[PDB]
Amino acid sequence: GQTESDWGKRCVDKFDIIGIIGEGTYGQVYKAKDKDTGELVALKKVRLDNEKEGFPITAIREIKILRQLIHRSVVNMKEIVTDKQDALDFKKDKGAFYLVFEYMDHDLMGLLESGLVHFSEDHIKSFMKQLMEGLEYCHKKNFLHRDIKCSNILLNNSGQIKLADFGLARLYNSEESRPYTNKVITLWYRPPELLLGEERYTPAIDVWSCGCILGELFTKKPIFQANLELAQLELISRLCGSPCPAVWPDVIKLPYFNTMKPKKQYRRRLREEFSFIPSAALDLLDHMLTLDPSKRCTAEQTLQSDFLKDVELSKMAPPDLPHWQDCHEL
Amino acid sequence: TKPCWYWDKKDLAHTPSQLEGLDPATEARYRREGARFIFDVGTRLGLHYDTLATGIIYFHRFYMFHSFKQFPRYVTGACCLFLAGKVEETPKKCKDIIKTARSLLNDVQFGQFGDDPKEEVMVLERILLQTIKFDLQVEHPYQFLLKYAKQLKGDKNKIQKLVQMAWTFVNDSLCTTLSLQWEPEIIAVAVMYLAGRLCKFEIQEWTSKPMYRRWWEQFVQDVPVDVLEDICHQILDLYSQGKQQMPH
Amino acid sequence: MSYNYVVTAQKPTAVNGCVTGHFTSAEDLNLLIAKNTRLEIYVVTAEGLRPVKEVGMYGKIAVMELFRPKGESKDLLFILTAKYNACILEYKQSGESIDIITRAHGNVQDRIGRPSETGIIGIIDPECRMIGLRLYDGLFKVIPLDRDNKELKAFNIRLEELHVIDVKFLYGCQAPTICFVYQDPQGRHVKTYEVSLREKEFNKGPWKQENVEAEASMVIAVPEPFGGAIIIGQESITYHNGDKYLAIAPPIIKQSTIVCHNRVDPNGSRYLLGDMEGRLFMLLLEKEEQMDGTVTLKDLRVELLGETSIAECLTYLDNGVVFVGSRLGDSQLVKLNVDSNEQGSYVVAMETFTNLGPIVDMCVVDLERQGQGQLVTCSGAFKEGSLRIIRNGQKLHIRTVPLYESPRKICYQEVSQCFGVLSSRIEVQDTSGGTTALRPSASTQALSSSVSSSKLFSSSTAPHETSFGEEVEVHNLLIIDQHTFEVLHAHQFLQNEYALSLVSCKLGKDPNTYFIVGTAMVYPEEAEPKQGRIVVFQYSDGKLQTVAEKEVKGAVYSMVEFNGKLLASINSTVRLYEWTTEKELRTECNHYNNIMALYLKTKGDFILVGDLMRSVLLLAYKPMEGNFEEIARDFNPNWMSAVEILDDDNFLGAENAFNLFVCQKDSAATTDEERQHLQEVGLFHLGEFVNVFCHGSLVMQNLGETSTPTQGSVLFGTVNGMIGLVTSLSESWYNLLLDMQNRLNKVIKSVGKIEHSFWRSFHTERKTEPATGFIDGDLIESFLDISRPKMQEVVANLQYDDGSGMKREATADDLIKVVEELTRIH
Numbered sequence A: 001g002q003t004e005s006d007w008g009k010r011c012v013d014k015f016d017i018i019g020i021i022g023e024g025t026y027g028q029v030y031k032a033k034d035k036d037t038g039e040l041v042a043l044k045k046v047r048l049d050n051e052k053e054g055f056p057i058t059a060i061r062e063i064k065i066l067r068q069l070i071h072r073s074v075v076n077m078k079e080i081v082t083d084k085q086d087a088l089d090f091k092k093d094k095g096a097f098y099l100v101f102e103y104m105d106h107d108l109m110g111l112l113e114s115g116l117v118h119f120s121e122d123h124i125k126s127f128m129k130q131l132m133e134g135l136e137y138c139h140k141k142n143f144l145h146r147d148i149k150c151s152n153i154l155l156n157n158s159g160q161i162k163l164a165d166f167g168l169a170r171l172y173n174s175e176e177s178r179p180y181t182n183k184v185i186t187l188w189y190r191p192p193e194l195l196l197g198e199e200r201y202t203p204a205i206d207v208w209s210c211g212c213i214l215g216e217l218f219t220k221k222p223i224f225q226a227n228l229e230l231a232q233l234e235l236i237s238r239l240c241g242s243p244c245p246a247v248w249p250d251v252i253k254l255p256y257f258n259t260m261k262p263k264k265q266y267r268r269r270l271r272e273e274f275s276f277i278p279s280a281a282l283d284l285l286d287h288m289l290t291l292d293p294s295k296r297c298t299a300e301q302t303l304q305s306d307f308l309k310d311v312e313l314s315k316m317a318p319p320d321l322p323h324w325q326d327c328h329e330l
Numbered sequence B: 001t002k003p004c005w006y007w008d009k010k011d012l013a014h015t016p017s018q019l020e021g022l023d024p025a026t027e028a029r030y031r032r033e034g035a036r037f038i039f040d041v042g043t044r045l046g047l048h049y050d051t052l053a054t055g056i057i058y059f060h061r062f063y064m065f066h067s068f069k070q071f072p073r074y075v076t077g078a079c080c081l082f083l084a085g086k087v088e089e090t091p092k093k094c095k096d097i098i099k100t101a102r103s104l105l106n107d108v109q110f111g112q113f114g115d116d117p118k119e120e121v122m123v124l125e126r127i128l129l130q131t132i133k134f135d136l137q138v139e140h141p142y143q144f145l146l147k148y149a150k151q152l153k154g155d156k157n158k159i160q161k162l163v164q165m166a167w168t169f170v171n172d173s174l175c176t177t178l179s180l181q182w183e184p185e186i187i188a189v190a191v192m193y194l195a196g197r198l199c200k201f202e203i204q205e206w207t208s209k210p211m212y213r214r215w216w217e218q219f220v221q222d223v224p225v226d227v228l229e230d231i232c233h234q235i236l237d238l239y240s241q242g243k244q245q246m247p248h
Numbered sequence C: 001m002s003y004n005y006v007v008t009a010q011k012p013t014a015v016n017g018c019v020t021g022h023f024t025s026a027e028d029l030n031l032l033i034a035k036n037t038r039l040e041i042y043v044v045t046a047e048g049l050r051p052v053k054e055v056g057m058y059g060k061i062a063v064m065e066l067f068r069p070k071g072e073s074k075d076l077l078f079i080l081t082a083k084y085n086a087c088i089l090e091y092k093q094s095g096e097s098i099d100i101i102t103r104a105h106g107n108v109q110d111r112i113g114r115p116s117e118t119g120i121i122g123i124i125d126p127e128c129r130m131i132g133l134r135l136y137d138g139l140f141k142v143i144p145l146d147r148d149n150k151e152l153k154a155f156n157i158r159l160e161e162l163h164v165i166d167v168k169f170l171y172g173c174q175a176p177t178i179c180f181v182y183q184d185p186q187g188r189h190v191k192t193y194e195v196s197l198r199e200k201e202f203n204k205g206p207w208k209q210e211n212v213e214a215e216a217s218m219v220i221a222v223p224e225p226f227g228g229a230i231i232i233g234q235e236s237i238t239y240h241n242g243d244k245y246l247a248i249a250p251p252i253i254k255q256s257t258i259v260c261h262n263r264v265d266p267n268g269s270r271y272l273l274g275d276m277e278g279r280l281f282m283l284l285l286e287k288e289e290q291m292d293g294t295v296t297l298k299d300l301r302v303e304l305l306g307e308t309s310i311a312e313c314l315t316y317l318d319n320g321v322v323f324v325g326s327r328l329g330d331s332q333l334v335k336l337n338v339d340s341n342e343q344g345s346y347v348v349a350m351e352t353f354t355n356l357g358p359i360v361d362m363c364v365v366d367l368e369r370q371g372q373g374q375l376v377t378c379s380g381a382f383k384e385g386s387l388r389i390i391r392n393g394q395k396l397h398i399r400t401v402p403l404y405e406s407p408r409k410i411c412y413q414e415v416s417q418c419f420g421v422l423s424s425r426i427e428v429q430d431t432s433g434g435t436t437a438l439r440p441s442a443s444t445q446a447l448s449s450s451v452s453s454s455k456l457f458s459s460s461t462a463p464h465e466t467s468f469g470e471e472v473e474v475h476n477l478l479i480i481d482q483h484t485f486e487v488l489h490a491h492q493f494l495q496n497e498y499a500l501s502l503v504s505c506k507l508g509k510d511p512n513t514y515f516i517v518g519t520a521m522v523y524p525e526e527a528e529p530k531q532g533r534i535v536v537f538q539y540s541d542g543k544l545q546t547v548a549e550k551e552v553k554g555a556v557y558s559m560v561e562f563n564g565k566l567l568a569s570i571n572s573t574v575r576l577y578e579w580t581t582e583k584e585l586r587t588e589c590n591h592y593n594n595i596m597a598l599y600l601k602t603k604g605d606f607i608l609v610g611d612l613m614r615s616v617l618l619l620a621y622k623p624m625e626g627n628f629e630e631i632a633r634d635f636n637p638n639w640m641s642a643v644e645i646l647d648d649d650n651f652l653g654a655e656n657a658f659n660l661f662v663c664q665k666d667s668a669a670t671t672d673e674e675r676q677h678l679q680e681v682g683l684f685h686l687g688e689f690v691n692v693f694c695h696g697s698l699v700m701q702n703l704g705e706t707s708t709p710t711q712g713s714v715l716f717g718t719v720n721g722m723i724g725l726v727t728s729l730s731e732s733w734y735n736l737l738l739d740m741q742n743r744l745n746k747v748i749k750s751v752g753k754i755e756h757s758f759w760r761s762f763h764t765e766r767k768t769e770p771a772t773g774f775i776d777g778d779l780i781e782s783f784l785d786i787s788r789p790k791m792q793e794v795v796a797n798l799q800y801d802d803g804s805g806m807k808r809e810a811t812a813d814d815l816i817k818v819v820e821e822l823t824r825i826h
């Protein structure tokens, strides 16, 4: 069990780089295949050239958090490789390192953004249950994936889902509060507490982002789409209700509460505007998109929901791909 | 999967330092010197105790793969503390650690850092990460000393005297190779075992099984008294060498 | 940044909808034909149609209905665009000045909603009390037709039935009632609801729900005399009204799917129907009046009238004439006779309106060597399939070459003075075990003919099961002369083999010019075809000769000539073949990081790959290493429909969402990743579905060179028959025309008060982005049509800062001359 443990000693020469596949949390993700095994792997890391702090601390966080987490719904970091290092000349060595991840077939963003894939109710059940099982595992280890986006949600053609980029992930502690960056999640998936300036936020920040993803699979359009933080809070208020001390006692505690007020004190119209969603999912959506993070559901409670409690991981339902409609419709 | 970070006492006679002509007494001194160097510098920087031990664990493991003659001790210890800060989320600038080191080191000892003290340390970070095989997560006997003491119920003053005395023994065991010989759970039990003998406390009475005279077994399984006596013998050897007496 | 310029060379010709009413005046009978973003207004005469007005709208016309509320002299027009722009229009003519007034305007898009499968549906209450819109699943939007609703505000009523097929407003109901066919897991049913403007909710419908055919298609609102509704399906036609239930299932309508309907008699006795094979039917409603004064339905009858063009919309004009609005073929005016001719047909064609239909592929070729160039398109589908010869001559001259089968791809071979055309025809499983074609076509009427005797896939011992009556596609390679356009030869490919790509070129050291076809073995079970062939033909002395075949494990979606080597895309793989001295293909290098390599374009050693969802990728052959290498890729996900190379740094693409975009190399080589990042520098909502990009120009060139402000010429054909041109601009010319557009938009009044910037904005279901890097040439060329006071208002204070000088002020006449030069590029 130590052959696979020896890291940093292998070179990137064993991987042939196919090309770049996208932009990750801090750096761009590239694709490669191992010469020895022939396996497709996902590559991505940073550079050691900035001697201000040497090895990046945000990268050290992603290495520490990911090596502790092992789950069927989490991308497993395979190994870590380096550039060609000079013998005996380790002082002049300016070579960088590379993180080796497991490569998945597709990405949820590209599938939805193109509009080709279709999600049935059973497909969404297979999607959300795997998403919450991994999220509950990492939340159980007191870690927060502060960057839940469609580009970081990966799926294989079998139907298995995995989360990807943990570079923006930090550790959570209920006792010791550490101030964090108020802006951390993509504006379309950002929880309302971060819009209002919460620096010490709860693990419920990921539940809100996945809630916007749950509704996005039924409408094929993102729920809240705005270019500014205040405009984002307005769209959230028109659907989930305006932030008010009635539904959110500590909303006054948040700094930007008096600063960022919506136009009116809108009422919650979530169940009305989502009447086409099944009742099992609509109740889940209502709890996941709760304004107050203390009243917002947890990752385990979503797995004990009428929509996901009885879902079987054996019936892994892959998303429907068109066949001859890609050349000309029917 | 994960690398093994534990050797036997008999294996310490074959470290890269030993095979280059260094005698066993000198390497043990170089380890105690380097450990307090990481300890004293990080203490001046106001670092958490887990950060100090993390650099010390990196330090002990590093010279199982390398020789003290080829790598300066204080340059390596500074690099360990610098990396340990970013690992345990208590980061410090490299210039701030070098400044603290020069204050507490004489001209000769700081001469190991060469003409550029920062660069000689920053360069060693690559070799440190490769040597530790990128196994950054490190556990320490502190959390187990507290996790086991919380399950003890009885005289609050007697239990607290046990904790502080055992906690003192944990700080002293960092100066030794015990960190490499045994897991942190056994060390946390051994320091409870040592502080129990010195204070003449019968810890089993404070446990949920008051007649289970081998109280530690409900904490850490498969630990013979031979291991606890071996650890206790090594910890008290530090006090007997320097002639200092038990804290008590 | 990149700068481009797009103009429409041929407006959309496919008819998307047609209605009859009294819109221009209360006396005239008008026929409003709706093409994509275009509205044509005609007046019915005894000889035909008289055009009166044609207006353009900044949106794709989705719903178009004429209605007359109480207190209006003549009918008003309601139009809803694809981007949910709603408006109510009125015709006003003061002598010779004809203008269309925007009575109401608004955007009915909902923030949240799943777009329905059967598309946007628009119906109006018979009493003109409300406008019914079906935009999202489980939601029914109601626009109350009140005098004060000039903003067209609307509310949504919750709908239990999520999957609706079609809906109409019923006749003869006390309260406004809708009738719709919905589909649940228990099949399809028809249900009714009553709309209440006062309660703003649904009440229980008049008549109960019935279990109907699983393939129920359309709902027909039978007028007051009979009442109720008629449900059209694939095999049965059913009438539902209260307890009365009637169902006819004639055997003739089972042969072809019915697609359109129209009412002939206002009393509701006769209805028109049309199928996919062009047949025109008449639905007769026999009346049984009961000694109580009431007119119940005796029976239903269907009679075949004749054959028309495959029509998207039918509309009956008075005195027995019917307008056949076709999307797949030429639109027609047909006369319905009471007596059948000697052939048994009651239909006789009056006029033929040319429709380029679906332009699947096209090539620019100077057939007559006039330096001008002609555009030869594969146009039409099924019986309406044809070739079109287009030339600039001031109106386009178009010659039609009917094929009577579906054309696929075309290529020109000057060495043989002929074209290569891939085509497909529809045959039906007969009783002999084989297949029998419905009609003769170009593949059957060839002078000489041949069939592939290949044994590559003859490894299947058990041939797949065939039942009688199932349609099959038969693919052929047509050799058509360039002068007579006579089908000289037709090569029929293997059974279940689809022709997808076609190229004509020489390869390697082989001097013979070859026809090369990339095919695919298509079976219904296939989870993407896994068999295919690359076949090389040589047309010599009137006979097509099979030169060589190469077996591939997938579909050859596209091929192209590369430096004397054959570049072919097979499923996710992009392969480069070498033509050996033994006249056989040999693989050199491959690239695999694709999903479905569809469209390929080459220029030098660079290769542009158009993926199903990865957008565009740049590939380099690199002759030294002998392997492909990724250069740069567009990381914004897009569903590509056609790609094209503009220059060595700019690339042009087309999306399935009717959007054009332009990628370019970042042109700043800091990090190697910036180079690898193709930056989308142009965005533009075209409104049309581009199928084929083609370099070239149809303008007459009499040695004139560089006299144009524009550089380059790219032609493209669309599904609606629209043909356009894309060209690049300098930064000086771009800012001049772009600043002019903003001045023209504030000046020009749009139909329905639609913002031009909103119309040209990049638009998918998920993203809405403003247009950039593109100059709407149709808006710039409209400067030569606005009145003189509007011209000077646009040129007032307009200073051009082209550079290498100072912001000189523009004159009104100086801008008129510039646009006249821009009108010469098409």
Ligand SMILES: Cn1cc(-n2cnc3c(NCc4nc5cc(Cl)c(Cl)cc5[nH]4)nc(N4CCOCC4)nc32)cn1
Residues within 6 Å of the ligand: A020, A021, A022, A023, A024, A029, A042, A044, A075, A101, A102, A103, A104, A105, A106, A107, A109, A110, A151, A152, A154, A164, A165, A166, C593, C614, C633, C634, C635
């Ligand atoms: C941090 N981390 C990432 C991974 N990781 C593993 N596997 C993939 C993966 N595989 C599907 C996939 N999508 C593709 C799109 C294109 Cl255009 C191309 Cl050419 C190839 C593609 N492959 N995608 C991505 N994304 C990165 C950023 O933007 C989009 C997706 N991350 C991946 C593991 N850890």
